[PDB]
mmCIF file of C-alpha atoms in Angstrom:
data_model
loop_
_atom_site.group_PDB
_atom_site.id
_atom_site.type_symbol
_atom_site.label_atom_id
_atom_site.label_comp_id
_atom_site.label_asym_id
_atom_site.label_seq_id
_atom_site.Cartn_x
_atom_site.Cartn_y
_atom_site.Cartn_z
ATOM 1 C CA UNK E 989 -10.128 46.789 -39.846
ATOM 2 C CA UNK E 990 -9.860 44.468 -42.846
ATOM 3 C CA UNK E 991 -8.882 41.509 -40.662
ATOM 4 C CA UNK E 992 -12.237 41.749 -38.896
ATOM 5 C CA UNK E 993 -14.230 42.488 -42.044
ATOM 6 C CA UNK E 994 -12.760 39.438 -43.792
ATOM 7 C CA UNK E 995 -13.546 37.227 -40.792
ATOM 8 C CA UNK E 996 -17.151 38.435 -40.648
ATOM 9 C CA UNK E 997 -17.505 37.873 -44.399
ATOM 10 C CA UNK E 998 -16.188 34.326 -43.994
ATOM 11 C CA UNK E 999 -18.655 33.858 -41.136
ATOM 12 C CA UNK E 1000 -21.492 34.936 -43.423
ATOM 13 C CA UNK E 1001 -20.356 32.475 -46.086
ATOM 14 C CA UNK E 1002 -20.168 29.605 -43.598
ATOM 15 C CA UNK E 1003 -23.605 30.410 -42.182
ATOM 16 C CA UNK E 1004 -25.082 30.248 -45.684
ATOM 17 C CA UNK E 1005 -23.587 26.797 -46.166
ATOM 18 C CA UNK E 1006 -24.872 25.856 -42.728
ATOM 19 C CA UNK E 1007 -28.416 26.877 -43.680
ATOM 20 C CA UNK E 1008 -28.326 24.848 -46.914
ATOM 21 C CA UNK E 1009 -27.051 21.866 -44.943
ATOM 22 C CA UNK E 1010 -29.840 22.288 -42.407
ATOM 23 C CA UNK E 1011 -32.478 22.501 -45.143
ATOM 24 C CA UNK E 1012 -31.253 19.241 -46.663
ATOM 25 C CA UNK E 1013 -31.131 17.674 -43.199
ATOM 26 C CA UNK E 1014 -34.735 18.671 -42.499
ATOM 27 C CA UNK E 1015 -35.905 17.344 -45.882
ATOM 28 C CA UNK E 1016 -34.201 14.035 -45.163
ATOM 29 C CA UNK E 1017 -35.833 13.852 -41.734
ATOM 30 C CA UNK E 1018 -39.281 14.421 -43.233
ATOM 31 C CA UNK E 1019 -38.724 11.624 -45.744
ATOM 32 C CA UNK E 1020 -37.332 9.385 -43.001
ATOM 33 C CA UNK E 1021 -40.456 9.861 -40.882
ATOM 34 C CA UNK E 1022 -42.685 9.127 -43.888
ATOM 35 C CA UNK E 1023 -40.779 6.054 -45.072
ATOM 36 C CA UNK E 1024 -38.383 4.783 -42.392
ATOM 37 C CA UNK E 1025 -35.710 2.164 -43.010
ATOM 38 C CA UNK E 1026 -32.088 1.400 -42.156
ATOM 39 C CA UNK E 1027 -30.923 3.088 -45.373
ATOM 40 C CA UNK E 1028 -32.954 6.226 -44.687
ATOM 41 C CA UNK E 1029 -31.591 6.356 -41.138
ATOM 42 C CA UNK E 1030 -27.993 6.081 -42.356
ATOM 43 C CA UNK E 1031 -28.678 8.825 -44.922
ATOM 44 C CA UNK E 1032 -30.153 11.095 -42.256
ATOM 45 C CA UNK E 1033 -27.220 10.454 -39.907
ATOM 46 C CA UNK E 1034 -24.835 11.329 -42.726
ATOM 47 C CA UNK E 1035 -26.553 14.686 -43.188
ATOM 48 C CA UNK E 1036 -26.671 15.312 -39.445
ATOM 49 C CA UNK E 1037 -22.932 14.695 -39.099
ATOM 50 C CA UNK E 1038 -22.356 16.998 -42.080
ATOM 51 C CA UNK E 1039 -24.364 19.706 -40.333
ATOM 52 C CA UNK E 1040 -22.292 19.295 -37.152
ATOM 53 C CA UNK E 1041 -19.145 19.510 -39.285
ATOM 54 C CA UNK E 1042 -20.159 22.930 -40.613
ATOM 55 C CA UNK E 1043 -21.191 24.082 -37.119
ATOM 56 C CA UNK E 1044 -17.664 23.307 -35.902
ATOM 57 C CA UNK E 1045 -16.249 25.424 -38.754
ATOM 58 C CA UNK E 1046 -18.602 28.285 -37.896
ATOM 59 C CA UNK E 1047 -17.524 28.096 -34.243
ATOM 60 C CA UNK E 1048 -13.868 28.267 -35.337
ATOM 61 C CA UNK E 1049 -14.589 31.448 -37.291
ATOM 62 C CA UNK E 1050 -16.458 32.990 -34.366
ATOM 63 C CA UNK E 1051 -13.509 32.213 -32.083
ATOM 64 C CA UNK E 1052 -11.213 33.973 -34.566
ATOM 65 C CA UNK E 1053 -13.467 37.043 -34.562
ATOM 66 C CA UNK E 1054 -13.434 37.095 -30.764
ATOM 67 C CA UNK E 1055 -9.640 36.901 -30.739
ATOM 68 C CA UNK E 1056 -9.421 39.783 -33.221
ATOM 69 C CA UNK E 1057 -11.714 41.855 -31.013
ATOM 70 C CA UNK E 1058 -9.638 41.005 -27.931
ATOM 71 C CA UNK E 1059 -6.314 42.206 -29.339
ATOM 72 C CA UNK E 1060 -8.212 45.283 -30.496
ATOM 73 C CA UNK K 911 -26.682 50.315 -26.402
ATOM 74 C CA UNK K 912 -30.185 48.842 -26.563
ATOM 75 C CA UNK K 913 -29.478 47.132 -29.888
ATOM 76 C CA UNK K 914 -26.761 45.072 -28.210
ATOM 77 C CA UNK K 915 -28.713 44.476 -25.007
ATOM 78 C CA UNK K 916 -31.706 43.175 -26.973
ATOM 79 C CA UNK K 917 -29.475 40.859 -29.014
ATOM 80 C CA UNK K 918 -27.823 39.443 -25.893
ATOM 81 C CA UNK K 919 -31.245 38.939 -24.293
ATOM 82 C CA UNK K 920 -32.421 37.072 -27.394
ATOM 83 C CA UNK K 921 -29.233 35.003 -27.219
ATOM 84 C CA UNK K 922 -30.040 34.084 -23.621
ATOM 85 C CA UNK K 923 -33.561 33.053 -24.615
ATOM 86 C CA UNK K 924 -32.303 30.887 -27.476
ATOM 87 C CA UNK K 925 -29.695 29.220 -25.266
ATOM 88 C CA UNK K 926 -32.411 28.285 -22.772
ATOM 89 C CA UNK K 927 -34.408 26.642 -25.546
ATOM 90 C CA UNK K 928 -31.224 24.954 -26.718
ATOM 91 C CA UNK K 929 -30.632 23.479 -23.257
ATOM 92 C CA UNK K 930 -34.196 22.124 -23.026
ATOM 93 C CA UNK K 931 -33.780 20.596 -26.474
ATOM 94 C CA UNK K 932 -30.497 19.010 -25.430
ATOM 95 C CA UNK K 933 -32.041 17.579 -22.259
ATOM 96 C CA UNK K 934 -34.820 15.950 -24.276
ATOM 97 C CA UNK K 935 -32.256 14.693 -26.789
ATOM 98 C CA UNK K 936 -30.175 13.094 -24.036
ATOM 99 C CA UNK K 937 -33.251 11.464 -22.467
ATOM 100 C CA UNK K 938 -34.194 10.017 -25.841
ATOM 101 C CA UNK K 939 -30.670 8.682 -26.339
ATOM 102 C CA UNK K 940 -30.740 6.947 -22.955
ATOM 103 C CA UNK K 941 -34.048 5.280 -23.805
ATOM 104 C CA UNK K 942 -32.742 4.362 -27.259
ATOM 105 C CA UNK K 943 -29.709 2.617 -25.766
ATOM 106 C CA UNK K 944 -31.926 0.740 -23.294
ATOM 107 C CA UNK K 945 -34.560 -0.320 -25.827
ATOM 108 C CA UNK K 946 -33.323 0.152 -29.403
ATOM 109 C CA UNK K 947 -35.550 -0.089 -32.465
ATOM 110 C CA UNK K 948 -36.173 1.636 -35.791
ATOM 111 C CA UNK K 949 -38.884 3.807 -34.212
ATOM 112 C CA UNK K 950 -36.635 4.856 -31.333
ATOM 113 C CA UNK K 951 -33.851 5.691 -33.787
ATOM 114 C CA UNK K 952 -36.165 7.858 -35.898
ATOM 115 C CA UNK K 953 -37.374 9.611 -32.727
ATOM 116 C CA UNK K 954 -33.805 10.276 -31.608
ATOM 117 C CA UNK K 955 -32.834 11.589 -35.053
ATOM 118 C CA UNK K 956 -35.833 13.913 -34.958
ATOM 119 C CA UNK K 957 -34.640 15.377 -31.661
ATOM 120 C CA UNK K 958 -31.058 15.624 -32.893
ATOM 121 C CA UNK K 959 -32.125 17.559 -35.992
ATOM 122 C CA UNK K 960 -34.245 19.807 -33.762
ATOM 123 C CA UNK K 961 -31.190 20.500 -31.614
ATOM 124 C CA UNK K 962 -29.130 21.396 -34.703
ATOM 125 C CA UNK K 963 -31.965 23.683 -35.815
ATOM 126 C CA UNK K 964 -31.749 25.686 -32.587
ATOM 127 C CA UNK K 965 -27.934 25.753 -32.776
ATOM 128 C CA UNK K 966 -28.206 27.393 -36.204
ATOM 129 C CA UNK K 967 -30.534 30.038 -34.718
ATOM 130 C CA UNK K 968 -28.117 30.660 -31.850
ATOM 131 C CA UNK K 969 -25.250 31.064 -34.333
ATOM 132 C CA UNK K 970 -27.330 33.603 -36.286
ATOM 133 C CA UNK K 971 -27.843 35.641 -33.117
ATOM 134 C CA UNK K 972 -24.148 35.486 -32.250
ATOM 135 C CA UNK K 973 -23.284 36.708 -35.755
ATOM 136 C CA UNK K 974 -25.674 39.634 -35.247
ATOM 137 C CA UNK K 975 -23.986 40.516 -31.948
ATOM 138 C CA UNK K 976 -20.583 40.421 -33.634
ATOM 139 C CA UNK K 977 -21.822 42.725 -36.389
ATOM 140 C CA UNK K 978 -23.199 45.164 -33.805
ATOM 141 C CA UNK K 979 -19.843 45.169 -32.026
ATOM 142 C CA UNK K 980 -18.013 45.737 -35.321
ATOM 143 C CA UNK K 981 -19.942 48.859 -36.322
ATOM 144 C CA UNK K 982 -19.403 50.023 -32.750
ATOM 145 C CA UNK Y 1418 -8.308 41.743 -18.906
ATOM 146 C CA UNK Y 1419 -7.811 38.364 -17.236
ATOM 147 C CA UNK Y 1420 -11.550 37.654 -17.212
ATOM 148 C CA UNK Y 1421 -11.560 37.773 -21.010
ATOM 149 C CA UNK Y 1422 -8.267 35.926 -21.420
ATOM 150 C CA UNK Y 1423 -9.490 33.080 -19.201
ATOM 151 C CA UNK Y 1424 -12.754 32.843 -21.150
ATOM 152 C CA UNK Y 1425 -10.933 32.704 -24.488
ATOM 153 C CA UNK Y 1426 -8.581 30.042 -23.110
ATOM 154 C CA UNK Y 1427 -11.572 27.986 -21.968
ATOM 155 C CA UNK Y 1428 -13.079 28.465 -25.428
ATOM 156 C CA UNK Y 1429 -9.897 27.095 -26.991
ATOM 157 C CA UNK Y 1430 -9.999 24.075 -24.687
ATOM 158 C CA UNK Y 1431 -13.642 23.355 -25.510
ATOM 159 C CA UNK Y 1432 -13.017 23.681 -29.247
ATOM 160 C CA UNK Y 1433 -10.224 21.110 -29.002
ATOM 161 C CA UNK Y 1434 -12.594 18.682 -27.309
ATOM 162 C CA UNK Y 1435 -15.182 19.502 -29.951
ATOM 163 C CA UNK Y 1436 -12.741 18.620 -32.738
ATOM 164 C CA UNK Y 1437 -11.837 15.274 -31.133
ATOM 165 C CA UNK Y 1438 -15.536 14.520 -30.749
ATOM 166 C CA UNK Y 1439 -16.142 15.393 -34.390
ATOM 167 C CA UNK Y 1440 -13.271 13.174 -35.540
ATOM 168 C CA UNK Y 1441 -14.711 10.219 -33.633
ATOM 169 C CA UNK Y 1442 -18.167 11.023 -35.004
ATOM 170 C CA UNK Y 1443 -16.870 11.037 -38.579
ATOM 171 C CA UNK Y 1444 -15.010 7.743 -38.064
ATOM 172 C CA UNK Y 1445 -18.188 6.169 -36.725
ATOM 173 C CA UNK Y 1446 -20.169 7.452 -39.704
ATOM 174 C CA UNK Y 1447 -17.671 5.946 -42.144
ATOM 175 C CA UNK Y 1448 -17.913 2.572 -40.412
ATOM 176 C CA UNK Y 1449 -21.705 2.859 -40.298
ATOM 177 C CA UNK Y 1450 -21.881 3.430 -44.055
ATOM 178 C CA UNK Y 1451 -19.564 0.466 -44.679
ATOM 179 C CA UNK Y 1452 -21.331 -1.941 -42.321
ATOM 180 C CA UNK Y 1453 -24.771 -0.636 -41.320
ATOM 181 C CA UNK Y 1454 -26.881 -2.134 -38.547
ATOM 182 C CA UNK Y 1455 -29.113 -1.086 -35.657
ATOM 183 C CA UNK Y 1456 -26.156 -1.251 -33.251
ATOM 184 C CA UNK Y 1457 -23.961 0.885 -35.502
ATOM 185 C CA UNK Y 1458 -26.771 3.422 -35.869
ATOM 186 C CA UNK Y 1459 -27.241 3.662 -32.097
ATOM 187 C CA UNK Y 1460 -23.469 4.085 -31.679
ATOM 188 C CA UNK Y 1461 -23.386 6.854 -34.279
ATOM 189 C CA UNK Y 1462 -26.358 8.623 -32.676
ATOM 190 C CA UNK Y 1463 -24.589 8.450 -29.323
ATOM 191 C CA UNK Y 1464 -21.555 10.202 -30.792
ATOM 192 C CA UNK Y 1465 -23.711 12.757 -32.590
ATOM 193 C CA UNK Y 1466 -25.532 13.667 -29.375
ATOM 194 C CA UNK Y 1467 -22.156 13.918 -27.626
ATOM 195 C CA UNK Y 1468 -20.982 16.333 -30.311
ATOM 196 C CA UNK Y 1469 -24.112 18.474 -29.858
ATOM 197 C CA UNK Y 1470 -23.487 18.428 -26.103
ATOM 198 C CA UNK Y 1471 -20.033 19.961 -26.558
ATOM 199 C CA UNK Y 1472 -21.387 22.487 -29.084
ATOM 200 C CA UNK Y 1473 -23.848 23.701 -26.441
ATOM 201 C CA UNK Y 1474 -20.946 24.150 -23.991
ATOM 202 C CA UNK Y 1475 -18.948 26.068 -26.595
ATOM 203 C CA UNK Y 1476 -21.947 28.332 -27.251
ATOM 204 C CA UNK Y 1477 -22.233 29.000 -23.501
ATOM 205 C CA UNK Y 1478 -18.592 30.091 -23.405
ATOM 206 C CA UNK Y 1479 -19.034 32.327 -26.444
ATOM 207 C CA UNK Y 1480 -22.054 33.960 -24.791
ATOM 208 C CA UNK Y 1481 -19.918 34.623 -21.704
ATOM 209 C CA UNK Y 1482 -17.222 36.250 -23.847
ATOM 210 C CA UNK Y 1483 -19.836 38.448 -25.512
ATOM 211 C CA UNK Y 1484 -21.178 39.515 -22.122
ATOM 212 C CA UNK Y 1485 -17.661 40.376 -20.938
ATOM 213 C CA UNK Y 1486 -17.129 42.477 -24.057
ATOM 214 C CA UNK Y 1487 -20.474 44.228 -23.539
ATOM 215 C CA UNK Y 1488 -19.771 45.399 -19.989
ATOM 216 C CA UNK Y 1489 -16.379 46.488 -21.296
#
């Protein structure tokens, strides 16, 4: 079952990165609301796109797990 | 199988919240495009971050379901 | 097992759309950082919301797969 175990471990790793990304995104939003500006908006958008990027990777891993389970 | 049932029910609940969040996000975007401004942009970013926040929660639940299925 | 196969095929299709959306989102971000403005920010937000929209659809499909596996 190592194929599945490895996939779930990679999922765990990606979710940890996703959480860190989300934390930074939320911090940026709080600062943006306090002191808004074009620069702060661009910064926040950057971090939002980065969060979406990791979400896409997490979804890829989940799809892989589902395919492993299906051939099983 | 209650562990799995409960997880899938929680998934359903989170997805409903996610849909409401997305609806509000889309409404905000439409208003932003009609009448853009720094304030409207900050508001839209707020709702986008909130949507990402719920997505992360949904992904957590999915990971839990996959772990339940794996020990099964 | 066609129910599951069809769901996984639909998942694959949605993930391909998600990747294209993400690529366009990243391109927009790069241009935004190079030449920022209110218009560019609105454009980037539009593409970010669109990416979230597809993510929600992908999560729906994943939930369906998990429900198929559960009744199985």
